[PDB]
Amino acid sequence: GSHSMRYFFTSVSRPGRGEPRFIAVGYVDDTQFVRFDSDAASQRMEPRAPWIEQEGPEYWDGETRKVKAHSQTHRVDLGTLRGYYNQSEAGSHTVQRMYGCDVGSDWRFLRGYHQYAYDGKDYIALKEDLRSWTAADMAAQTTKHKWEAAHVAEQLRAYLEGTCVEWLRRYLENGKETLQRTDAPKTHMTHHAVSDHEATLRCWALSFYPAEITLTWQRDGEDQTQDTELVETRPAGDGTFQKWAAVVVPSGQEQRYTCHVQHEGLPKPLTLRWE
Amino acid sequence: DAKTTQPPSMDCAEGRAANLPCNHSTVDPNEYVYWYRQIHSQGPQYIIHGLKNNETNEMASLIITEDRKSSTLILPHATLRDTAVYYCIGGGTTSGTYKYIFGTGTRLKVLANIQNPDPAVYQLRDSKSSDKSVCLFTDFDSQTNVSQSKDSDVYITDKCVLDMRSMDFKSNSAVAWSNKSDFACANAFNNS
Amino acid sequence: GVSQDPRHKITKRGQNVTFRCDPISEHNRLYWYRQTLGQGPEFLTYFQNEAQLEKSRLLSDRFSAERPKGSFSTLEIQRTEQGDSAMYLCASSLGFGRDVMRFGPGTRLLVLEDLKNVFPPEVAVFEPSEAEISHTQKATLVCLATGFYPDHVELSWWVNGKEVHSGVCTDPQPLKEQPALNDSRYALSSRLRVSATFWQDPRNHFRCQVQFYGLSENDEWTQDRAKPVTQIVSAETWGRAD
Amino acid sequence: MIQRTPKIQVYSRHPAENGKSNFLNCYVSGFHPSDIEVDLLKNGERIEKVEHSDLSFSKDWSFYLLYYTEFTPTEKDEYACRVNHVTLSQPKIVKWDRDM
Amino acid sequence: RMFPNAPYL
């Protein structure tokens, strides 16, 4: 299958109660492998997956120096944005950047990312082209010229096409036991009687990786989105994920309903019906 | 870790192209390479960047090999002012290091082209006061060499090109002096 | 527009010194490097805004670099040793994109055990040879600056009370009067060549000028000879037709 | 200031058995801004040794966090998740369910 | 590895 590396960056201003809180995490697929917290004691990039602890001290000195420059950079960014939008130093604000890699099943480069958000809305993003920007506001339009003048794309493209791709493959080789695995969902289902006259049918899926999964409820082999409940896919905490879909049904008509599961680890989609 | 290699010295004829090479032996391909120039007791002056494709500007041009393991800075019609030490450096930015490692660099000495070689030594009497004297060795071609003398009393300066821009006339020159009544200008540059 | 002061500095061994750098504004990154005669610059420190993120494992402890307002930067050397003597370069970069590092003009620090070794230059000027005028119909003047330490000098020719650049070549770097001696005095030469007609014109004035950067006005001086402070020293000629 | 409500879930890491070592998770997702209070309750009482995941976010820039702790449930004790946000004018508590 | 020159807005 295909794979991805993404670094996510979050800086939030807390004016008058300290300097901005900055958090930088790194993922490969749905497995996190690095952390940095500006408020944390260590002031170093820390391993959060066992396969990356392999990396020498030069890796951590370097990645810590880079992530510190990001903390420093985003601190300025909140200040710059406040100025761009003519807003007051009183209010709290949040800054968000994402960049990363995609590779296909052939481990050849697929696409590159560099996206940015101010308090939850798209600010600026680099296009699929890796050579040009999409500015939302006039604010982002000024950021756009600043980056075109500097020639940001030049090596940012080289990083996402090159170094980012090169190192994602090295991570997939080193952590192949955790990254390249495919844990198929452990499906069951439960029946709770809300009363006489009604009943709930919950469709389980547990201990699966990666997180991508589909649960759908059919009434007599026909899709029903009416009176369903879909919970957000949730992490178990041990590198696996859980998801369930429920439907409230008339009592007696239990075996009229079927739950459709789709996962990459499942050779073809399992269907579930009440015993 | 991110080092380059260049030849220590190089001579080029004025007006022709100066081709200064650099090997990016250990520089990551996705890192910028930079070129700087510097003369005695001055801050290094920037020239040109390099990443994948070749570059050019009013100062010079840089042509990058396919492998990006070697580059060539090119000064098209090398003026006498282009004589300096040239530094090719490469980023180590991909690791968490924002240093750059300068080597010795190539000291380019562009030689002025002498139309009418007229080697001669002269003697110049002191002005203001005193009977002190210094020897001038002027008008020789850019092939000529000078040396530090056996005697500790005698001082010989390095060669130096002159340009009187109002006559398109350029001439070399080299001075000598010493402390003794017993010292002739004949024997100042004659042991060369 | 990377600025540095002072351009030169002599200090006594054991004394403390501080250099300032005012970088290009809009530049997030600031670097310190140092340079000894005939070597490439050596990295000391790197700033991203206010934050010192990379020290040079080799050069520090007695050295202290700050950049409090993420703008101007100071570098302090407590208890100087002779081995601190070098050109200290500031540099700034935008912090992203081609991120090109622009150098300053440098602080030339020289640390001495004793300031007794500091001298300003003796300057003389030499009149063109009779033979040389007859042979080429050109006249070469020769300037000599001798017996100055340190080698912080700038030489220029002034014709008739205006600085000239055409017709002059100065030695690329000064030469040592005793190349073997520990802390040897320095010498420097310069040639001004003009038409034979312009020399023999006795209306014309020729002056050689060597600016020398010596002790400050606030340096302790207790020797018999004059205090070798910052000064210009000159030597004059008038044209001679005879 | 595009603000969003947290979507809270409370559950165990493994199948819940009375008197067995298990982890109690509280997953908050989809919320904005990042600033959030999350505590785990044992009989309407805050638990001390409660770690939390590193703050990451999704395609749409909405934050998600996992608050978890080592515990052992008997037949009697009540577990829940206390969560306050800018979105929530009041504190919300989602009770642990052995079947939700 | 992270990108080392995160550009300032």
Domain range list for chain C = 1-113, 114-242
In contact, A83 and A142? CB cutoff 8 Å: no
Chains that touch A (3 or more CB pairs under 8 A): B, C, D, E
Question: Distance from A148 to chain C by nearest Cα, in Å?
Answer: 9
CA–CA dist D40, D91 (Å, integer): 13
**Sequence-ordered list of residues with C-beta below 8 angstroms from that of A117, at least 6 positions apart, any chain:** A95, A96, A97, A123, D61
Residue with tokens 């944390």: A40
Could you identify the residue written with the tokens 């059919």?
A: A218
| Closest chain E residue to B31, measured at CA | E4
Helix (H) or strand (E) holding C47: strand C42-48
Closest by Cα among D31, D73, D83, D81 to D56 = D31
E4 CB near a chain C CB, below 8 Å?
Answer: no
Inter-CA distances, B79 with B62, B72, B106, B170, C171, Å: 18, 18, 17, 12, 18
Q: Which two tokens stand for residue B100?
A: 């750059």
- B83 to B11, B168, C153: CA distances (angstroms): 9, 19, 20
Which residue reads 């130093």 in tokens?
A89
Alpha-carbon distances, residue A260 vs A155, A245, A267, B120 (angstroms)? 45, 10, 14, 102
**Burial letters A110-143, b for 16+ CB under 10 A, else e:** eebbbbbbbbbebbbbbeeebeebebeeebbeeb
Specify the length of chain B in residues: 192
- The CATH number linked to D10 is 2.60.40.10
Q: Is A171 helix (H, G, I), strand (E, B) or coil?
A: helix
> Do B51 and A163 count as a contact with CB atoms less than 8 A apart?
no
Which one of C191, C195, C211, C237 makes the best mutation probe of the B interface by having the most chain B beta carbons within 10 Å? C191
Task: Determine the residue of chain B that is closest to A59 in CA distance.
Answer: B95
SS (H, E, C) D73-98: CCCCCCEEEEEECCCCCCCEEEECCC
Check CB contact under 8 Å for D61 and A242: no
What counts of helices (H) and strands (E) characterise chain A?
5, 16
Neighbours of D21 (CB within 10 A): 10
What contacts C195, CB < 8 A, 6 or more positions away?
B167, C137, C138, C139
Number of domains in chain D: 1
**Nearest-neighbour CA in chain A from C39: distance (Å):** 27
* DSSP-assigned beta bridge partners for residue D10: D26
- Identify how the structure was determined: X-ray
Domains of chain A: 1-181 (3.30.500.10), 182-270 (2.60.40.10)
CB-based burial label for A30 (10 Å; 0-12, 13-18, 19+): middle
End-to-end CA distance of chain E: 22
Q: Do C97 and E8 touch (CB under 8 A)?
A: no
Domain boundaries, position D40:
1-100
Residue D99: its chain A contacts at CB < 8 A?
190, 192, 202
Asked if the peptide bond before residue B44 counts as cis, ω within 30 degrees of 0, the response is no
- Cβ contacts of A147 on chain C, cutoff 8 Å: 96-97
Q: Across the interface, do B94 and E5 touch by the CB < 8 Å criterion?
A: no
CA atoms within 13 Å, Cβ hemisphere of B41? 14
Both tokens assigned to C71 = 């703008």
Q: What is the DSSP string of chain B?
A: ----B--SEEEEETTSPEEEEEE-TT--TTS-EEEEEE-TT---EEEEEESSS-EE-SS-EEEE-SSSSEEEEEESS--GGG-EEEEEEE--TTTT-------S-EEEEEEP--SS---EEEEEEBSSS---EEEEEES--TT------S-SS-EEPPP--EEETTTTEEE---EEE-S-SS--STTTSTT-
| Resolution of the experimental structure, in angstroms | 3.0
Residues from chain B contacting residue A66 (CB–CB below 8 Å): 96
Q: What is the DSSP letter of C116?
A: G
Residues 124-153, chain A, touching C (beta carbon < 8 A):
147, 149-152
Q: Which residues of C touch E5 (CB under 8 A)?
A: 95-97, 99
Give the minimum alpha-carbon distance from A115 to chain E in angstroms, rounded to a whole number: 11
Between chain C and chain E, the number of residue pairs with CB atoms below 8 A apart is 11
Task: Write the CB contacts of A108 (distance below 8 Å, at least 6 apart in sequence).
Answer: none
Q: Does the beta carbon of E5 lie under 8 angstroms from any beta carbon of chain C?
A: yes
CA distance A120 to A139: 15
Do E5 and C28 count as a contact with CB atoms less than 8 A apart?
Answer: no
In this structure, which topology does domain C1-113 adopt according to CATH?
Immunoglobulin-like (2.60.40)
Establish whether chain A is in contact with chain B, requiring a minimum of 3 CB pairs below 8 angstroms: yes
